[PDB]
Design an enzyme around this catalytic site. Structure first.
Site, PDB file in Angstrom:
ATOM      1  N   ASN B   9       0.864  -1.165   0.000  1.00  0.00           N
ATOM      2  CA  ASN B   9       0.000   0.000   0.000  1.00  0.00           C
ATOM      3  C   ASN B   9       0.898   1.210   0.000  1.00  0.00           C
ATOM      4  O   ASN B   9       1.445   1.605   1.027  1.00  0.00           O
ATOM      5  CB  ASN B   9      -0.873   0.002   1.228  1.00  0.00           C
ATOM      6  CG  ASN B   9      -1.762   1.215   1.274  1.00  0.00           C
ATOM      7  OD1 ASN B   9      -1.871   1.968   0.309  1.00  0.00           O
ATOM      8  ND2 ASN B   9      -2.415   1.415   2.400  1.00  0.00           N
ATOM      9  N   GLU B 165      -5.405  -4.816  10.765  1.00  0.00           N
ATOM     10  CA  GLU B 165      -4.385  -3.810  11.026  1.00  0.00           C
ATOM     11  C   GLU B 165      -4.780  -3.066  12.287  1.00  0.00           C
ATOM     12  O   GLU B 165      -5.641  -2.186  12.254  1.00  0.00           O
ATOM     13  CB  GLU B 165      -4.269  -2.839   9.868  1.00  0.00           C
ATOM     14  CG  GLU B 165      -4.087  -3.496   8.561  1.00  0.00           C
ATOM     15  CD  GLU B 165      -3.610  -2.534   7.531  1.00  0.00           C
ATOM     16  OE1 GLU B 165      -4.337  -1.671   7.124  1.00  0.00           O
ATOM     17  OE2 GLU B 165      -2.393  -2.670   7.096  1.00  0.00           O
TER      18      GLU B 165
END
Lengths: 248, 248
Positions: B9, B165
């Site tokens: 990402n 996360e």
């Protein structure tokens, strides 16, 4: 009048095939007068349009940006756009104010940062139907403009274009009349003249948007304080050529 | 274990020069094991990465999307991405939940639409530090997951990857320990097994993200319910190669 602008806000629309065809149409349209044309594709289509658009009167704009790179998943920053060659941005569009939480202070901060980073900015302002019916149009648009102005120096206004788009006219088919638009543009220009400077006001482009099409554009442009258009739906069609030519 | 994923990402970062250099690094790294690598550039960099990335283990993902084209200035839709060849998307990243108003119901709707449109989805979930300290981790992550699940059919789960996360681990350097991560991954997989199906649970990839680097990746991957990583900061660096190789 200052140099007009005809700006195409494609919004969240397009395919590679449809864009290739439309850009060809725009390339083959010879523009003989002094106008800045702007096309604002979605982020993912910017490279395609950069590769195919050749008409010298056009620049490419982004439809939004954030001020700084970093840990902002999904967003595109002003430095990233500059690096890819895009130095125009639309900021504060009604759709972002409505759907995506952009308050006057967020818009003003974005505009300020864009100006510091050398962008030309199309900053959008406009009242809702409820505000219009409450006779609040002037208060609203001046409050939106002064929020932006509070973060800018006088020099930065050379980079700013204002776009007045009554919210009730965006995408609805209910264009403002030339008199409605001119009344607001004149009020805005007077405010800029008094609060920023008369030299700034004389050179400032104030565009109208909200259901502009090729048939109503010329009678809007005839008004003294209208400097062009921000066009949504009709900018996806070949008749954008006639909107450009209505700024002669 | 199912096929691992190593996902980069890039967030709102990159220049054309830095991306060209990093993609070259990724191209020259020969990956010998079965792993799906994913790179998620900003929207404007997708075409560049499509042009330069050649490593056969990689696909390109978007970092966000909206479900439908239309009058959404600044946004990029799922049909637009599909047309340009992108059929992976990250949805519900903490940064979007925090900064950009994405509630569980917005994320769940986006995930559902992405699945209907044939995307592979990396759907992000995770608790804040305050929730962790209140012993609410399980309640939070299961509530986020069940909101997504409520909009999906069993078949759609073949397209879903979950990324756990913890918010306190994203970008902070404070990675979860392998035991912390495994506890949550196991709880998630058990919930999927009981509420969706044991066949779904066995094949579901649950990735960990939040301060993964090349030194801690292998000891996270050793845990039985961790299927790879969603990597932010370290995916902008050449050591992403070693994160990939930690999924052997």
């Amino acid at each position: 009048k200052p140099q007009p602008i005809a700006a195409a806000n494609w919004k969240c629309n397009g395919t590679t095939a449809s864009i290739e065809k439309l850009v060809q149409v725009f390339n083959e349209h010879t523009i003989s007068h002094d106008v800045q044309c702007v096309v604002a594709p979605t982020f993912v289509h910017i490279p395609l349009v950069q590769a195919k658009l050749r008409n010298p009167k056009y620049v490419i704009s982004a439809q939004n940006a954030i001020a700084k790179s970093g840990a902002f998943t999904g967003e595109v920053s002003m430095p990233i756009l500059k690096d890819i060659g895009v130095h125009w941005v639309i900021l504060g569009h009604s759709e972002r104010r409505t759907y995506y939480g952009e308050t006057d202070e967020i818009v003003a901060q974005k505009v300020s940062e864009a100006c510091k980073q050398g962008f030309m900015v199309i900053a959008c302002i406009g009242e809702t139907l409820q505000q219009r019916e409450a006779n609040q149009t002037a208060k609203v648009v001046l409050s939106q403009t002064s929020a932006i102005a509070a973060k800018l120096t006088k020099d930065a206004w050379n980079q700013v274009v204002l776009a007045y788009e009554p919210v009730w006219a965006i995408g609805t088919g209910k264009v403002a009349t030339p008199e409605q638009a001119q009344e607001v543009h004149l009020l805005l220009r007077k405010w800029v003249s008094e609060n920023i400077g008369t030299d700034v006001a004389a050179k400032l482009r104030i565009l109208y948007g909200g259901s502009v099409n090729a048939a109503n554009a010329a009678t809007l442009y005839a008004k003294p304080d209208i400097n062009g258009f921000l066009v949504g739906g009709a900018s996806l069609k070949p008749e954008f050529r006639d909107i450009i030519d209505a700024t002669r």
